[PDB]
Amino acid sequence: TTALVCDNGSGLVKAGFAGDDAPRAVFPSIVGRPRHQGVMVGMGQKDSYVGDEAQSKRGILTLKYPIEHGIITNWDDMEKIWHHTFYNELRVAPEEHPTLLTEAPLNPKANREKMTQIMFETFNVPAMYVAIQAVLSLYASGRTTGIVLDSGDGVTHNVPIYEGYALPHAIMRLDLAGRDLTDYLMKILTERGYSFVTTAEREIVRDIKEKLCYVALDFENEMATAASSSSLEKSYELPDGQVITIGNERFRCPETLFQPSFIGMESAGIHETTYNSIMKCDIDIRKDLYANNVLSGGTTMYPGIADRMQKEITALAPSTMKIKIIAPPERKYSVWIGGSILASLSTFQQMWISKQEYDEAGPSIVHRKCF
Amino acid sequence: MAVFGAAAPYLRKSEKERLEAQTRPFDLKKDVFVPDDKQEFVKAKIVSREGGKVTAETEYGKTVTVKEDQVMQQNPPKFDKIEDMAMLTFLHEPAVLYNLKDRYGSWMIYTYSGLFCVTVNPYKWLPVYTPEVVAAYRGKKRSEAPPHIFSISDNAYQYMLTDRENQSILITGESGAGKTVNTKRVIQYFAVIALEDQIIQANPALEAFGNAKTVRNDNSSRFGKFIRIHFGATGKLASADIETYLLEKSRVIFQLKAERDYHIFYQILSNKKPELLDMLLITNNPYDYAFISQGETTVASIDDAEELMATDNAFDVLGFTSEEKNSMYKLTGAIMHFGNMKFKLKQREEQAEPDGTEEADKSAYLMGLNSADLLKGLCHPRVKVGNEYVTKGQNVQQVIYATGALAKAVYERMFNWMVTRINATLETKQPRQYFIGVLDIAGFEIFDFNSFEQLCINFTNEKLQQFFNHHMFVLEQEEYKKEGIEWTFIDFGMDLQACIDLIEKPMGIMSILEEECMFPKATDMTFKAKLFDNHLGKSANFQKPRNIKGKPEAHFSLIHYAGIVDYNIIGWLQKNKDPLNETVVGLYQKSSLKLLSTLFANYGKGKAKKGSSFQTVSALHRENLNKLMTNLRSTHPHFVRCIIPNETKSPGVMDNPLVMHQLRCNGVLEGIRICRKGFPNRILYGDFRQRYRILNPASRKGAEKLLSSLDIDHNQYKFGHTKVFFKAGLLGLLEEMRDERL
Numbered sequence A: 001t002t003a004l005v006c007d008n009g010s011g012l013v014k015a016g017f018a019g020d021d022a023p024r025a026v027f028p029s030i031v032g033r034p035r036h037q038g039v040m041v042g043m044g045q046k047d048s049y050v051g052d053e054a055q056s057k058r059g060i061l062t063l064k065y066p067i068e069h070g071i072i073t074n075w076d077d078m079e080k081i082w083h084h085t086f087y088n089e090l091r092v093a094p095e096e097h098p099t100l101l102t103e104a105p106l107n108p109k110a111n112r113e114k115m116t117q118i119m120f121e122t123f124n125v126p127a128m129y130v131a132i133q134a135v136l137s138l139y140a141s142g143r144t145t146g147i148v149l150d151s152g153d154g155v156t157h158n159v160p161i162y163e164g165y166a167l168p169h170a171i172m173r174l175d176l177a178g179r180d181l182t183d184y185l186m187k188i189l190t191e192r193g194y195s196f197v198t199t200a201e202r203e204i205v206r207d208i209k210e211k212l213c214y215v216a217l218d219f220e221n222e223m224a225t226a227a228s229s230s231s232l233e234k235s236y237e238l239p240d241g242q243v244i245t246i247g248n249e250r251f252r253c254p255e256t257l258f259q260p261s262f263i264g265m266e267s268a269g270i271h272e273t274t275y276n277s278i279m280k281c282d283i284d285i286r287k288d289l290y291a292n293n294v295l296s297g298g299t300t301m302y303p304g305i306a307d308r309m310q311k312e313i314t315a316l317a318p319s320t321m322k323i324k325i326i327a328p329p330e331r332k333y334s335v336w337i338g339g340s341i342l343a344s345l346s347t348f349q350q351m352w353i354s355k356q357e358y359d360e361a362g363p364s365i366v367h368r369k370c371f
Numbered sequence B: 001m002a003v004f005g006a007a008a009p010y011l012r013k014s015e016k017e018r019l020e021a022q023t024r025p026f027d028l029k030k031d032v033f034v035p036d037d038k039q040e041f042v043k044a045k046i047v048s049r050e051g052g053k054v055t056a057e058t059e060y061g062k063t064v065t066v067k068e069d070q071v072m073q074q075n076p077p078k079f080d081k082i083e084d085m086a087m088l089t090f091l092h093e094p095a096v097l098y099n100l101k102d103r104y105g106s107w108m109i110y111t112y113s114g115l116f117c118v119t120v121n122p123y124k125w126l127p128v129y130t131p132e133v134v135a136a137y138r139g140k141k142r143s144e145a146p147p148h149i150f151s152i153s154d155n156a157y158q159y160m161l162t163d164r165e166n167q168s169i170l171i172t173g174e175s176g177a178g179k180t181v182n183t184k185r186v187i188q189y190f191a192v193i194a195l196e197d198q199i200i201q202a203n204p205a206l207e208a209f210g211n212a213k214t215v216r217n218d219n220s221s222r223f224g225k226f227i228r229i230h231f232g233a234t235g236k237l238a239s240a241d242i243e244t245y246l247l248e249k250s251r252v253i254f255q256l257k258a259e260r261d262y263h264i265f266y267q268i269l270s271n272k273k274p275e276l277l278d279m280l281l282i283t284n285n286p287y288d289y290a291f292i293s294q295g296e297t298t299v300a301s302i303d304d305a306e307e308l309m310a311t312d313n314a315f316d317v318l319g320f321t322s323e324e325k326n327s328m329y330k331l332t333g334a335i336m337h338f339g340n341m342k343f344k345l346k347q348r349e350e351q352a353e354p355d356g357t358e359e360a361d362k363s364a365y366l367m368g369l370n371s372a373d374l375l376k377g378l379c380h381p382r383v384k385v386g387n388e389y390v391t392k393g394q395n396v397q398q399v400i401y402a403t404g405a406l407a408k409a410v411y412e413r414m415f416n417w418m419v420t421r422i423n424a425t426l427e428t429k430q431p432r433q434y435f436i437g438v439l440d441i442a443g444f445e446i447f448d449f450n451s452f453e454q455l456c457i458n459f460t461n462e463k464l465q466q467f468f469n470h471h472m473f474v475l476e477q478e479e480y481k482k483e484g485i486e487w488t489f490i491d492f493g494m495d496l497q498a499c500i501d502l503i504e505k506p507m508g509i510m511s512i513l514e515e516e517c518m519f520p521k522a523t524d525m526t527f528k529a530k531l532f533d534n535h536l537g538k539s540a541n542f543q544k545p546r547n548i549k550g551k552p553e554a555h556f557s558l559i560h561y562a563g564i565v566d567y568n569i570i571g572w573l574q575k576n577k578d579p580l581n582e583t584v585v586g587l588y589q590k591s592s593l594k595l596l597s598t599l600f601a602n603y604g605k606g607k608a609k610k611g612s613s614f615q616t617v618s619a620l621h622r623e624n625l626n627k628l629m630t631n632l633r634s635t636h637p638h639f640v641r642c643i644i645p646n647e648t649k650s651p652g653v654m655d656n657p658l659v660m661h662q663l664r665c666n667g668v669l670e671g672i673r674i675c676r677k678g679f680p681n682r683i684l685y686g687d688f689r690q691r692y693r694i695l696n697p698a699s700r701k702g703a704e705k706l707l708s709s710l711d712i713d714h715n716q717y718k719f720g721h722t723k724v725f726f727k728a729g730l731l732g733l734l735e736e737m738r739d740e741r742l
């Protein structure tokens, strides 16, 4: 038997089989419902589109994300997402496959409890397990120490690990991510004349962000460069023509990661929460952590983010340390890759939570040594 | 006794000479088998049993004392020279050694040993291979005719014809101990009873592409050759098929301190074909090429230049063109050019980039790809994530493992396709019914620096020996259900399967090795620690190593049927990795050569697609062994055991250590040991009477009266309805009471 590695994320579902080199199914975690009335009789419209289909019918739907910041807020939508993943994308029967699921640090406990209750009762999986995203990133990176910065789409977090032991008191979690960057980019494009308001235009703005945004190495110098030159402006082609041209908005959007006061948050940038997690860690492992700073997740994928973060952390740390930032090209899928590695490990086969254990001890079994 | 032509003496000595040799004094008390120093057990006499002191007077004039706990009787003279080792009155280890010793001194080659057929090769010509005995055997039975492989060949044939099933001949011996010519005479006999020339003609190709120098042999076979001889409905010769199994890939890359790579690279390195070297850019110096130079560079094995010529001749006389041999040679040269590639880490990153490009250019010009394109495909693989491709990163270790796996893959691919071409040449359109296959496999090799490859070999031989053991179990159950005497319903296989479960099963050695080469920062010490933490004491066969006579090193020891083997860990993680590079495989599919056929296509709804990185030599090997067992377990098997008498080509004189080594590593001793738990001495009632009636001179009542008046216990003999079963002690006691009766 083989296991299923479903990294449900928050804004992208990634599923596949344990032992693969990459996820087989990657689609947005979206549930769309029609908002107009529907006149053609006989074509038999359905009531909810889930996944990559909702992006095709995007023009006549209201797109909902069932998961807000790591946390699941709509359990019916999430059951639809999982059903679509199991049956219409992987085409497997979950009654005969263990399932490894992934979660961010410092979430509510009812999240995991309801997740496993659903997986055992609605889908009847034989076993299941919930892993932390950062640990799986560090598996897939081929390290055993290092401070991992996993910037997804709802949540950003640092998890310092040394020699296979994690330092829980030094785990930092920040609720600024790609979704807030998209909202800031909408709000900041509005000052050039373009307005995107609907949930179906949020997707167009997310595409603009992915395709044109980058991190400036020096924010003030890039601002002056954009104010004087015009060599920074790119054009983008909306899905109906009418090209839009954006200038300093390209590097002004992901700069919110380093100055979260742009969106009215009080906290510190990612370069500073990384350093603060390191300084919470014990003094004997800080050199290794400085040398093994691992990036993963979709929001770490801007051009120039590694160079920017190295410049910042280097200016912060003592001048006699080797700051080094590991940013693989397959960053976005690191959590899934590590999950596949972990579920294929042979030592792991007695760490699943079986159906018998669940029927014995209730959903509370999730927080036990079978974590 | 004239039916055996001129070979009659060598095939079987006359009854008259048997009786004239029977008359010989032998003391059953003080001529017992005795441990030795120069050998294991030597013929000697004891003066007396003085407490813990005895004195063995051997032939050499020595008078050593041995302990009363290591002495055991010698075979009686009235049962020496026995054709069937299973019928020996006393089944000991050196007993059978001396049996075969006197049989080869008396120049009797073949000897029955139960379900086996043992054959020590004679070094000079005998009339035993003349066609007269071949034709004249037709009509004689196995149970009566003296041992020979023609017997078991005919028995397999008639078994096929009566049961309408396939049979399997398992010839077991070392390359260079006569296996080739043994199989040759097998195929001759099969043709006689109704394409051998073609087999021998295409053989040098396999001898090249699947043989390499080990320490125990300079022409050792690595792949599991296996020839299927089909037939028709009328049991007449139809066609022949051949399959290759378990070809070791690690040799193409890593070679030990004392051994070489495959023969082909050296044969090409023979300058007698300068056109090959100047068309492949191969410099004469063998130290130049890193894949090969780590092994033994050159040895006095054979005339490698002449062997190159013999292979080229066999090629030109085989169905395939000259361009195809040219492509074969150039492909092997490309495999050779892979080893010298050089990679460095980048400026301020963890990415691999090539510094040397010349060997890259020339290997691409050979392979039929672009050099920049192949370098890009090695440094930056592209993988499929849903409906998009993203580039994967690699460092130097990863790209080197990928290069090694690519080379091993292309070599093994070319090999399998060459075997397909050979079989196509051999192929005849005659309808092919049930076949009788003959199998050539590596041996249970033991050394002082056993490694991963030797572990794989021993695992294979474990599966084979357990298979034979279960086969003999069912055969003994057949004998019992015939005789109407059915007892001891335990099988004989699980006692060996318990050792298999320590290699294949999850948390076994292979699974731990796979997990360890998957884990991030694993090392050999961590591998050893996990092996110990997970097996030590909690298992039955896994146990500590042993350091004897200052051996090199050993990290743990398993026990097999062939003895305790100490294995070494160093290098297993690095050598087990087999990450195949999918982008470069696609490049090969898009080549401008024959390569696109070898790599034709290689790497939802339920998919067992293990990734390219989650690939391990051990896992591929376990799969191949599984399918080989599935091919064999459908055929009724037969077993042939070949022993070298001495390392020197001088006949007559032998080497007892080499004999013991062959016996243990072969499993004849394990067969006799499985016998030793039941009643191995099995004789009918009539001859029993004619030989033991004078003890109580006068069929169940008289036999029972004699047995009760011979002080025999119940559990010591089993009363049958055609034969009454006795053990070693019973035979000894009946012998003694006969002797005092006379």
Ligand SMILES: Nc1ncnc2c1ncn2[C@@H]1O[C@H](COP(=O)(O)OP(=O)(O)O)[C@@H](O)[C@H]1O
Residues within 6 Å of the ligand: A008, A009, A010, A011, A012, A013, A151, A152, A153, A154, A178, A179, A206, A209, A210, A211, A297, A298, A299, A301, A302, A303, A332
């Ligand atoms: N090339 C890119 N540049 C910038 N942002 C990107 C890029 N690719 C994806 N993203 C952002 O990453 C987010 C998705 O991150 P992901 O790794 O899928 O987290 P999750 O799996 O939890 O949704 C999206 O909101 C998208 O805006």
